Design a protein around this ligand. Structure first.
Ligand SMILES: Cc1cc2nc3c(=O)[nH]c(=O)nc-3n(C[C@H](O)[C@H](O)[C@H](O)COP(=O)(O)O)c2cc1C
Ligand SMILES: Cc1cc(Nc2ccc(C(F)(F)F)cc2)n2ncnc2n1
Ligand SMILES: O=C(O)c1cc(=O)[nH]c(=O)[nH]1
Length: 376
């Protein structure tokens, strides 16, 4: 460990006590931007590698979407010891999002509620940011093999979703290792942009198509077209809300198999939790420990319904190595953390990786890839 991490966690716990949540987030994004945040320079355990198709993760931990919506702070967040980051959700046109304050924490239950409503600087500006990250990456030893995914969304104003995605893909696809389609947020009407199997099916196919076109259109060899990490075309993921009945779930599984989607992110925030007293007057989706059991259960179901064919990215409610293993044995290949960072601070990646490494050894597993879906 380090004093650096120690000093910052005191600082962060202080901010947690006094300051508004969104103000804290921005301050830490700002420290990152300025590169005063601490680095995890440790070698990751080779027995904790993971992959989704031919996309390779130096470790099983990344930061979920909504954390660095505008890609202002990628180098620093990655250097906290994460293998990947999912920037966005982005929109073609920048939006203010809903009225502030729109992030509320509950320390006792280690949980968050939000109604940001896709605030972001918009596709063009964010693409400029990612471009600059990619150039920084070519000369930053700590960033090599690190993965940046991009989460893409419809504008609140907009009538048609596909058009919005196509635009995003056209602008930012060249710089992405994967694309995350989310139709799972709370906070855009209504309540969840539709994932109607026919709708979703239509959505997924349009996305792959746009990506394919970029490959066709460009005259360059892949080494100079894909200005990303993998040097190949961005994979396609879809992020699902956990607020669906068992039938809606089975119908979605078919669609993912039908379209041969590269992976699924399970899951987004939920609107089905009331136990939080602080949150009673509040609007939006809930994150953190209260989501943990719900989202795990959801991982299991979709793992079964897709016949284990389709790779899973786990979110959220994961704070410990134990929480991580529970997601992995349910059928998840990689894990994403949001809430843990707010709760546990700068050290989350370092701590969780150690915790998982120890736990993998004490359960007799040889490597991480052996534990994926081992509850069946
Ligand atoms: C403040 C806030 C903003 C979020 N913004 C997005 C977003 O822009 N796109 C997205 O797909 N998920 C977003 N999420 C959902 C997270 O990516 C994640 O799936 C969820 O928090 C569950 O993980 P956790 O329990 O570790 O927090 C957001 C969550 C919160 C807390
Ligand atoms: C205290 C706090 C912090 C914060 N986010 C935050 C940002 C960055 C990092 C860093 F990457 F630095 F770890 C850690 C935490 N939020 N977000 C909503 N409420 C928050 N309250
Ligand atoms: O931008 C938001 O408000 C938001 C998006 C999302 O996908 N999930 C979430 O909880 N909030």
């Amino acid at each position: 460990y380090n004093p650096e991490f120690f000093l910052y966690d005191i600082f962060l716990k202080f901010c947690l006590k006094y300051i508004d949540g969104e103000i804290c987030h921005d301050l830490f994004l700002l420290l990152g931007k300025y590169n005063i945040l601490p680095y995890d320079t440790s070698n990751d355990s080779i027995y904790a590698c993971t992959n989704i198709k031919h996309l390779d993760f130096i470790n099983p931990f990344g930061v979920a979407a909504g954390f660095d919506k505008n890609g202002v702070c990628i180098d620093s967040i990655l250097k906290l010891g994460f293998s990947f980051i999912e920037i966005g959700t982005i929109t073609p046109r920048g939006q203010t999002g809903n009225a502030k304050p729109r992030i509320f924490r509950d320390v006792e239950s280690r949980s968050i509620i939000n109604s940001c409503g896709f605030n972001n600087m918009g596709c063009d500006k964010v693409t400029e940011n990612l471009i600059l990250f990619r150039k920084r990456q070519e000369e930053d030893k700590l960033l090599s093999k690190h993965i940046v995914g991009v989460s893409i969304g419809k504008n609140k104003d907009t009538v048609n979703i596909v058009d919005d995605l196509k635009y995003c893909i056209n602008k930012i696809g060249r710089y992405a290792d994967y694309i995350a389609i989310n139709v799972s947020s709370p906070n855009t009407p209504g309540l969840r942009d539709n994932q109607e199997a026919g709708k979703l099916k239509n959505i997924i196919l349009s996305v792959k198509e746009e990506i394919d076109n970029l490959e066709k259109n460009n005259i360059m060899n892949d080494e100079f077209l894909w200005f990303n990490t993998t040097k190949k075309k961005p994979l396609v993921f879809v992020k699902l809300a956990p607020d669906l009945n068992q039938e809606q779930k089975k119908e979605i599984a078919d669609v993912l198999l039908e379209t041969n989607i590269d992976g699924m992110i399970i899951s987004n925030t939920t609107t089905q939790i009331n136990d939080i007293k602080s949150f009673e007057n509040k609007k939006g989706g809930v994150s953190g420990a209260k989501l943990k059991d719900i989202s795990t259960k959801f991982i299991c179901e979709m793992y079964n319904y897709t016949n284990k064919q389709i790779p899973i990215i786990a979110s959220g409610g994961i704070f410990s190595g134990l929480d991580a293993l529970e997601k992995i044995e349910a059928g998840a290949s990689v894990c994403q953390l949001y809430s843990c960072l707010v709760f546990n601070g700068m050290k989350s990646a370092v701590q969780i990786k150690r915790e998982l490494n120890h736990l993998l050894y004490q359960r007799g597993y040889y490597n991480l890839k052996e534990a994926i879906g081992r509850k069946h």
